[PDB]
Design a protein around this ligand. Structure first.
Ligand code: NFD
Ligand code: AVV
Ligand code: NCA
Lengths: 251, 251
């Protein structure tokens, strides 16, 4: 893959944009300057081989960047990026990882270290499936970890019950690796939302299969559990993109 | 009412981020670099009294910042900012002025000039309703003119039909002053979408009142014209937010 151009400029620009104007009524301000943020972020990967990284490489950066999160509002998702963020509504109904400072600064960006000056690669970045797992998941794994760790009260989980090749809940998702195991006794309940893509064969159902596994894990953390399939407000979102579906017919 | 802090840094940060990462498949890059853009912007109001502006003050800036816009995808809106932007879907279905470079950089921001150094006011910005209309509307009126002037093919206009106090179409709106009068022969059609808020009395309908005036006005310029109220895809977005309304009763 081709690395993002003028990485420092984009980082510092999104950082200043967010600081002054984004989520002011929804998430608290970070306590560090954007230059200090850049400095911890850069020294995490710079002057090293693109696969030298591990789960600790970005710890100082995420310590500098972490935000206290609104009780009851935190959302996780697997397999339904577009639907979860549409439904979250840019922080107004739920908060996602992407609404917090570090997700919003690096969302979609591409970067990597090298050993010669200037210590990063402007030309090429390795396909990351070529690195050991602790290295290919250094950044986004620690991100999901801090984030889950800060969740309080109710949390929400959106998933896909229409995928014949991917279970609604997998222990090897980012949610299963990093999120679920990191939630504290400050969390009280897990509310799952199963998406049935319209026009398509239903594959997972509440309490059966991987959702029944998930249920048992959640109760084992002494957390409450509920699960619903196409709740009306979410169904209406889907229907808007496919107003003809049989599921969408009105009285 | 307080002015945006670190205006220049916010402006430049937003400009750089948009340049490198935003709308890359949806809209073209402008030729002019960020510091050249800043120049043109700042000379418009700097070192003059706050109400010492007119429609031609920001002219060089908008000249520099204007993008060609993709055919059939331009949308206008009155009275329904949230609903129109949700439905336009960040450029994926329709483009709005807030998706273009100059609208993206200045959206939500607050600034004004002053005669003394630094040439702009960091303390307060006169309740712009204090100023002659050509000063109060110098920036966003010129933004709207330039945007409308660039539109091709079909264009769409989303309006409020439940406001007893404010008609669907008004000659004194930004659409009536700046946008409709500036559409060129490159535009072939104007498609109106009338929004009826759930559970609010319906005030305006296609073919009556101000919408009738709008139809004739649009017939004069030799565009086609259609109009529709609460079409399904828009209606479902509304129900998503108020699933229990009578209009959202499922069969
Ligand atoms: N914002 C994020 O990017 C982000 C990333 C990971 C986890 N999160 C947290 O964990 C859950 C989403 O991961 P999930 O439960 O695994 O659900 P998914 O739909 O499978 O998403 C993986 C897809 O993202 C793409 N991806 C991006 N970067 C990478 C990366 N370094 N490495 C890899 F492998 N994939 C990446 C990749 O193409 C892959 O196809 C959410 O609760 C979220 O808070 C957010
Ligand atoms: N000088 C000003 N500067 C700024 F930033 N905002 C202003 C100013 N004056 C009034 N406003 C606010 O700006 C809003 C004017 O909105 P509506 O009335 O809802 O629709 P319309 O008038 O047609 O103007 C929206 C249409 O103009 C171009 C755009 O692409 C779309 O086609 C009002 O809600 C009002 O609170
Ligand atoms: N975004 C705005 O404030 C705005 C105001 C007037 C016209 N167009 C946009």
């Amino acid at each position: 893959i081709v690395p993002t151009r003028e990485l420092e400029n984009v980082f510092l620009g999104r950082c200043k944009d967010y600081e002054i104007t984004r989520y002011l009524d929804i998430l608290p301000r970070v306590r560090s300057d954007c230059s200090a943020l850049w400095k911890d972020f850069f020294k995490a990967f710079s002057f090293k081989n693109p696969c030298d990284l591990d789960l600790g490489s970005y710890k100082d950066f995420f310590t500098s960047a972490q935000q206290q999160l609104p009780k009851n509002k935190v959302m996780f998702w697997s397999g339904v990026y577009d639907e979860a963020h549409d439904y979250a509504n840019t922080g107004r109904k739920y908060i996602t990882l992407e609404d917090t400072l570090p997700g919003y600064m690096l969302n979609s960006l591409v970067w990597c270290g090298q050993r010669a000056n200037p210590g990063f690669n402007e030309k090429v970045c390795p396909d990351f499936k070529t690195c050991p797992v602790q290295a290919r998941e250094s950044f986004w794994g620690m991100a999901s970890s801090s984030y889950a760790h800060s969740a309080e009260g109710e949390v929400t989980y959106m998933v896909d019950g229409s995928n014949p090749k991917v279970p609604a809940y997998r222990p090897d998702s980012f949610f299963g690796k990093y999120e679920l195991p990191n939630l504290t006794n400050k969390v009280t309940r897990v509310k799952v939302i199963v998406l049935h893509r319209l026009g398509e064969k239903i594959i997972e159902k509440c309490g059966a299969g991987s959702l029944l596994d998930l249920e048992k894990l959640v109760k084992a953390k002494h957390f409450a559990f509920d699960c619903v399939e196409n709740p009306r407000a979410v169904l209406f979102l889907l229907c808007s993109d496919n107003p003809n579906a049989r599921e969408c017919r009105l009285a």
